[PDB]
Amino acid sequence: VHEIVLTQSPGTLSLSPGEKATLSCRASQSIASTYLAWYQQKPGQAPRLLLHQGYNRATGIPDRFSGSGSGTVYTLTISGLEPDDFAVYYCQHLGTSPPYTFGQGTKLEIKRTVAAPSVFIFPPSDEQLKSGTASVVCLLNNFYPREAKVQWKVDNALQSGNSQESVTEQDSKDSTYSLSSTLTLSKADYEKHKVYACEVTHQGLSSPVTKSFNRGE
Amino acid sequence: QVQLKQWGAGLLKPSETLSLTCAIYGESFTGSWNDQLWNWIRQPPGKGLEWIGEINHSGDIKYASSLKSRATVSADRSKNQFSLKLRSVSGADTATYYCARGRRAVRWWAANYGFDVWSQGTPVIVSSASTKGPSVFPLAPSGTAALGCLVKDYFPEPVTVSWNSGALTSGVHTFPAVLQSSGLYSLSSVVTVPSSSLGTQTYICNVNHKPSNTKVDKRVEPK
């Protein structure tokens, strides 16, 4: 395609402090090194310039950050990974004229052993039912890696477009993630069905785990 | 000590106009070398960075293709400010907006040739809702158990959730809130607890939403 597209790999880099981090940025066509920059962003703050013109550290950037590459592939390398380095990293194309563009990003996170989620399903409270809406909440607790699939089933009917998820940041003690999914239904439609299941698929599970309940029982 | 201070309204109803202004401190609009680049960057929730537009030292203005019909980037020389105007705002425009400083890549072979100075940004949320206190619903537990609270239908952010007035911290997971299709936020906070103590221990979540002056204590008992 005609336009410039920066594709970063891997989408998620899982390492421990002290290891070497190799982040890649692939351009849809050849790019001069002058027009490539690297950024770091920690959750809740603005991005920070790491490298400019492909290889040059910005003011105040420690020595462990370095860049390499040419043409269509450029690399950001972190030699001795520090705990402060776990964040999101973007590459940018900033040529002699706009438009500029960024890569989709690479999340550098803490590596740990694979742990399966403990799944819980919560029926809607009677307090909420007295308002006209029914929220069914499913909990995925302390799992790793972050890649998890949550499928809602109402009377064995796979749901779609009526749920919302959110994931916590990587825990500071056990380095796991947690996930919460809410299935929203009107109170009337909620009284028309029986089985409400939360089917979870994760790398730590040899087969999908289903947490369900029967309305009324 | 070059800094950027950004100000503007972030809580917008659909079809209204986003108006943000960025103030320059420590540098002139053009710079000494006539090389300053004043850009606007957008970052939707959980997504990557998106460049919006740029007005340079000489006044030339370029927009991103997807926003060129609705964006107006300008600058006030005498006040050392530059602004971003985005009209007809919808839910797709919900994001944190930044202004940054760049330097033109002319005479590249001889400081920083990127976005080296960023402002603290502005969280822009597009919702038709007004200030509303939340409703707290229990997530009753049915050898490790889990219970929690459901903080639903409030606006705007944020809310403070505590368990037993801060006495219970181990095993607590307060998830990031999500913006429902109604324009109201919804949040859940959970905690994992040994199953044997469900009959003796008592658990009560403390929800505080200071925008609406709402402080709700809701205890969660077994079913």
Residue numbers in the entry:
A (entry chain L): -1 to 27, 27A, 28 to 95, 95A, 96 to 213
B (entry chain H): 1 to 31, 31A, 31B, 31C, 31D, 32 to 82, 82A, 82B, ...
Text of the article:
In this study, we investigated a donor who developed a family of potent HIV bnAbs with different lengths of an insertion in a critical framework region following infection with two founder viruses that were closely related and underwent extensive recombination. The bnAb lineage is defined by a CDRH3 length of 22 amino acids (aa), an IGHV4–34*01/IGHJ6*02 heavy chain (HC) and an IGKV3–20*01/IGKJ2*01 light chain (LC) gene. A greatly reduced ability for donor plasma to neutralize N332A Env-mutated pseudoviruses of different clades identified the V3-glycan bnAb site as the major target for PC39 neutralization breadth. Ab crystal structures show an extended CDRH1 that can help stabilize the CDRH3.
(d) Ribbon representation of PC39-50E Fab with 4aa CDRH1 insertion. When compared to other V3-glycan bnAb Fab structures, 11aa-insertion mAb HCs (17A, 23D and 50I) most closely resemble PGT135, which also has an insertion in CDRH1, while the LCs of these mAbs are more similar to that of PCDN-38B, with an RMSD of 0.48 Å (S12(A) Fig). The 4aa-insertion Fabs 50E and 55C could not be as readily compared to previously described N332-dependent bnAbs due to their CDRH3s, which are not completely resolved. However, we were able to fully resolve the CDRH3 of another 4aa-insertion mAb 50L and show that CDRH1 participates in stacking interactions to stabilize the CDRH3 despite the shorter insertion length. These differences in CDRH3 stability between the two antibody clades might explain contrasting neutralization potency despite similar breadth. For the 4 amino acid CDRH1 insert, stabilization is less apparent. However, in both 4 and 11 amino acid cases, the acquisition of a triad of tryptophan residues from CDRH1 and CDRH3 is observed, but it is not yet clear what the functional and evolutionary consequences are of this particular feature.
